[PDB]
Amino acid sequence: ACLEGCFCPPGLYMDERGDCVPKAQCPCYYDGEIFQPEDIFSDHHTMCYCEDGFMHCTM
Amino acid sequence: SGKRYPPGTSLSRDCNTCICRNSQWICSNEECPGECLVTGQSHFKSFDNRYFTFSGICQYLLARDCQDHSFSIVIETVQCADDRDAVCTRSVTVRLPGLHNSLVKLKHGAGVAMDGQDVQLPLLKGDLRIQHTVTASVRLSYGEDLQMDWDGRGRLLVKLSPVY
Amino acid sequence: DRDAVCTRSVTVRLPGLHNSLVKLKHGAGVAMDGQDVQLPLLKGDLRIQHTVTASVRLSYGEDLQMDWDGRGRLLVKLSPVY
Amino acid sequence: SLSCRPPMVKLVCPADNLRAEGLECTKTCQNYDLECMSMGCVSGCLCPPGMVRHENRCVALERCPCFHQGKEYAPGETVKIGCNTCVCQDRKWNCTDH
Amino acid sequence: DQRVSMPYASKGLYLETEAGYYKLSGEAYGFVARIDGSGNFQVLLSDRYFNKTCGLCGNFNIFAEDDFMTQEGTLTSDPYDF
Numbered sequence: 127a128c129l130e131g132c133f134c135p136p137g138l139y140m141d142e143r144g145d146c147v148p149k150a151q152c153p154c155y156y157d158g159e160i161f162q163p164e165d166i167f168s169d170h171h172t173m174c175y176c177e178d179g180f181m182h183c184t185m
Numbered sequence: 186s187g188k189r190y191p192p193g194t195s196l197s198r199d200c201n202t203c204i205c206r207n208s209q210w211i212c213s214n215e216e217c218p219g220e221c222l223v224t225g226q227s228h229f230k231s232f233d234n235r236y237f238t239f240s241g242i243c244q245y246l247l248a249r250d251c252q253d254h255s256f257s258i259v260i261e262t263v264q265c266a267d268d269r270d271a272v273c274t275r276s277v278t279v280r281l282p283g284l285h286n287s288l289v290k291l292k293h294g295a296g297v298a299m300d301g302q303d304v305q306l307p308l309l310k311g312d313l314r315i316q317h318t319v320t321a322s323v324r325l326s327y328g329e330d331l332q333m334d335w336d337g338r339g340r341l342l343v344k345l346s347p348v349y
Numbered sequence: 350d351r352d353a354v355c356t357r358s359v360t361v362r363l364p365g366l367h368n369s370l371v372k373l374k375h376g377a378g379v380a381m382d383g384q385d386v387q388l389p390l391l392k393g394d395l396r397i398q399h400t401v402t403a404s405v406r407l408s409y410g411e412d413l414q415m416d417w418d419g420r421g422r423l424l425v426k427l428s429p430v431y
Numbered sequence: 432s433l434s435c436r437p438p439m440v441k442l443v444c445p446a447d448n449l450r451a452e453g454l455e456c457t458k459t460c461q462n463y464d465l466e467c468m469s470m471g472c473v474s475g476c477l478c479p480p481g482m483v484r485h486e487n488r489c490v491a492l493e494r495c496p497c498f499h500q501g502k503e504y505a506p507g508e509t510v511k512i513g514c515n516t517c518v519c520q521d522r523k524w525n526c527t528d529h
Numbered sequence: 530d531q532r533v534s535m536p537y538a539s540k541g542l543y544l545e546t547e548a549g550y551y552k553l554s555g556e557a558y559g560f561v562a563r564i565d566g567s568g569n570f571q572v573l574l575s576d577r578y579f580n581k582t583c584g585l586c587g588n589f590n591i592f593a594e595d596d597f598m599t600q601e602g603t604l605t606s607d608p609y610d611f
């Protein structure tokens with residue numbers, strides 16, 4: 127619904143530490159694991175990175 | 186170490202003490218705890234103060250009690266950058282057969298997950314305590330003969346007392 | 350006063366999953382079977398997550414909701430199947 | 432689908448036992464003495480309890496070789512490290528104390 | 530960091546100008562680079578590096594479809610993340 131509470135402006139998104147930040151340093155939550163805004167990351171076969179909040183995986 | 190001390194003094198290493206008598210330090214040989222250290226990309230330190238490097242990508246066994254089976258630790262390495270010579274630690278898995286045969290897991294953040302369930306810290310069960318240290322790093326403490334450190338960005342440690 | 354009797358905690362019980370026992374504590378905290386838990390908690394059916402980051406919300410299936418029992422403002426949503 | 436080969440039999444995760452150590456904990460000759468993690472099994476086909484995998488071949492007996500310098504050694508074969516001989520009786524190398 | 534003049538010939542790399550356009554020859558090491566007036570890099574490279582030199586100009590093999598093999602080694606369909 128259209129709820130009531132404490133938000134921050136649309137350019138800013140909420141971070142875990144109470145502050146809210148733009149989507150540049152908004153971490154990724156792949157498989158529960160909290161990855162930093164720039165984390166290149168790969169097993170042998172898969173290839174994944176965190177750009178701006180989303181986790182871009184490939185194969 | 187290139188400096189003079191009078192006789193009768195007692196300087197102490199971290200391990201034990203030594204006293205000067207007739208230009209000859211007398212020293213005890215009582216054991217003192219070890220520290221296996223993972224850090225950086227792939228840089229290990231053994232308990233016996235050996236240093237080396239092994240950039241493999243699998244689930245490797247870091248440590249284990251091997252005459253009885255009080256515990257077992259399992260590192261999990263992954264490539265960690267564009268280069269091939271960059272293999273950092275993502276997670277570590279601890280296993281305590283003394284309590285439920287449970288399975289603790291230290292995740293890539295400061296997070297912990299017992300048996301799939303995420304957990305708020307502290308976690309006083311009977312033996313093992315898990316709590317933050319600076320509020321930016323987890324610390325497991327099973328009994329009085331085992332410690333750990335944060336495996337978020339890959340700086341695992343251990344403290345094994347001389348009973349092992 | 351004696352005419353002041355507030356709610357401290359509420360205990361939920363789901364026989365459909367393990368015969369577990371959820372507990373909403375006097376903060377915004379939750380405790381499944383003695384174990385404190387970080388939110389969210391996607392198990393199969395029940396989801397527990399914050400709402401404004403100051404209030405918990407249980408959601409078992411599509412026929413049950415809850416609300417925060419920190420300072421005592423419990424709610425429920427029961428769909429007409431009950 | 433693929434009906435797996437005769438020498439091994441398919442497994443199924445039971446819904447009751449959390450200890451569904453099936454396909455994920457595939458015991459080869461390296462990781463037999465080693466203890467493995469497992470969440471649940473998979474829809475794979477695993478060797479019987481009395482044998483293990485060995486380079487795309489489920490070697491039956493527990494006679495599989497004893498590695499050193501990443502090279503095969505059949506049981507009974509010896510190696511000379513220093514002034515000592517050392518033989519693999521069962522699966523671990525058996526050296527001399529000279 | 531020290532700006533040098535031109536031509537220049539140190540360490541077996543003759544840094545000349547040919548046809549009004551700048552050249553960097555490395556025949557001992559097996560390459561000839563150059564740039565034009567507008568700015569158009571070019572790299573002539575020997576057959577000694579066949580199915581080798583992997584980089585932003587791809588491997589020197591016969592095929593033309595497999596020559597996005599990343600620094601890990603991964604045939605990627607995208608010409609951009611490569």
Ligand SMILES: *[C@@H]1O[C@H](CO)[C@@H](O)[C@H](O)[C@H]1NC(C)=O
Nearest residue numbers: 518520521524525526527528
């Ligand atoms: C070697 O083999 C013998 C066989 O009886 C065994 O008793 C012994 O423990 C083994 N270890 C060594 C290296 O002696």
Ligand SMILES: *[C@@H]1O[C@H](CO)[C@@H](O)[C@H](O)[C@H]1NC(C)=O
Nearest residue numbers: 579580581588589590591592
């Ligand atoms: C390139 O290298 C691969 C691997 O060594 C080899 O199989 C292949 O024959 C070489 N040349 C071609 C034609 O791809």
Ligand SMILES: [Ca+2]
Nearest residue numbers: 588592593596
């Ligand atoms: Ca090509």
